[PDB]
Structure 1
């Protein structure tokens, strides 16, 4: 009622002696699609070894359970261009290369998400910088698909009555939250080999299934006499992860944020000849 109470280790090595028999563990046939399960004990004399190594750090939960940057953008407190005083990002995971490649090792994923925001500000250079400005405040707004979108820093849409938002003041700890599994399907799909229209026309690829919404950011009411620039960084961290259908890691460099397009690349590096073994 008050307190409820809730290791694997790799396989050991068994002692093996001399052998002379008709069994041939070493000989197999890869044509069957079967990976051989032989062990050193089956082809040479071995001693008894008790291993205590564990594969704890290789689990998908730990492999994908690290915060990684997915987007950064800059916005200014005051400027002549209205569009440059706030950000508007359509959520996707293909913008940054490292986390993209980590994710695309699997075809389908299902996880909760933990989002962290890091915001920093700096004064823009100019001929006159002497001013006194109190601490700034920022708003992060999440708009599910189909909702109204703000067109300027002081629009009515920023008065969220149903859209979740966060107000954060500089100098404190970074903002953070949790997000559940918000896919319409039974799992997220990194790849989609299909079209949007039923007659095989229109958009092609993963771009068709990206309908996660938008994120907007602004200075709440800060408007300094001299311009100030702020940068926001978004970090994603999967939780409670499950993965299906592994696929080989990518070899070619990425070139588009919403396409698989690539340039052909050599399989690997070369060496002097097939016998060269020295440095």
Structure 2
């Protein structure tokens, strides 16, 4: 029973890393997630046992809808269709729900109607360097390392609706594939405080007892 501690069986799992809502008629409603691994505290602690990682990426989106309270008179809507646009590092970015950056050609989008299998998509290892870097002892602002940049995701409705407001949620699932890890690192003791840096507050080494014997 020695193979469940390999790097493939330790890191290649699924994890809910983001959860956001958006509606159709608010003219402010669309979602946005910059792809990182530093948001949740249980995936960050596992990926920070190593200094340099190199993995492919696989994302799955779970999209549900809910009917908001409309006025009256027999709300009857067809099936809904969503657009999940992926912006590579160094691409145009939408600011409104109706924009020219949704219709561009180098931003690969998926289109998905409700009632089917969820829309999986996969992203290869995109970097100029040869590995990602969990830790960076240097300046770009201290410890940013602009070289590991995976991009941004954007979600919206493509159906125009007038008779009934509809809001929708989305849960993004994160799964590394073909993982390679270098230069191990001790596990983090203090609690995480911020996202970008390694700031902390000092804590005791271990839980204490009443005597040495």
Q: TM-score, normalised by structure 1?
A: 0.71
Q: Which structure features the higher share of strand residues?
A: 2
Give 5+ residue unaligned stretches, structure 1.
Answer: 1-53, 197-202
1:116 aligns with 2:47: no
Aligned to 1:68: 15
1:245 aligns with one of 176, 183, 188: 183
2:142 aligns with one of 198, 204, 213: 204
How many residues are aligned here?
A: 213
Give 5+ residue unaligned stretches, structure 2.
Answer: none
Structure number with the bigger relative contact order (C-alpha 8 A, sep ≥ 6) is: 2
Judged with a 3 Å threshold, the aligned counterparts in structure 2 of structure 1 residues 230 and 269 are, in CA distance, closer, same or farther, namely same
Native 8 Å contact 1:113 1:236 kept in 2: yes
Native 8 Å contact 2:127 2:147 kept in 1: no
Question: Equivalent residues in 2 for 1:89-128 (5 A)?
Answer: 89-124=33-68
3-state DSSP of counterpart to 2:4: helix
Using the TM superposition, give the Cα deviation of residue 123 of structure 1 relative to its aligned residue in structure 2, in angstroms: 2.5
Q: Which structure features the higher share of helix residues?
A: 1
Q: Distance in 1 between matches of 2:170 and 2:145?
A: 25
Native 8 Å contact 2:97 2:156 kept in 1: yes
Native 8 Å contact 1:72 1:234 kept in 2: yes
Using the TM superposition, give the Cα deviation of residue 274 of structure 1 relative to its aligned residue in structure 2, in angstroms: 2.3
Using the TM superposition, give the Cα deviation of residue 243 of structure 1 relative to its aligned residue in structure 2, in angstroms: 0.3
1:153-207 deviation digits (Å, cap 9, x = unpaired): 12222223221110011111111122211111110001111002xxxxxx11135
Using the TM superposition, give the Cα deviation of residue 129 of structure 1 relative to its aligned residue in structure 2, in angstroms: 9.5
Q: Distance in 2 between matches of 1:219 and 1:261?
A: 39
Larger radius of gyration: 1
Q: Distance in 2 between matches of 1:110 and 1:104?
A: 13
3-state DSSP of counterpart to 1:61: helix
Q: TM-score, normalised by structure 2?
A: 0.91
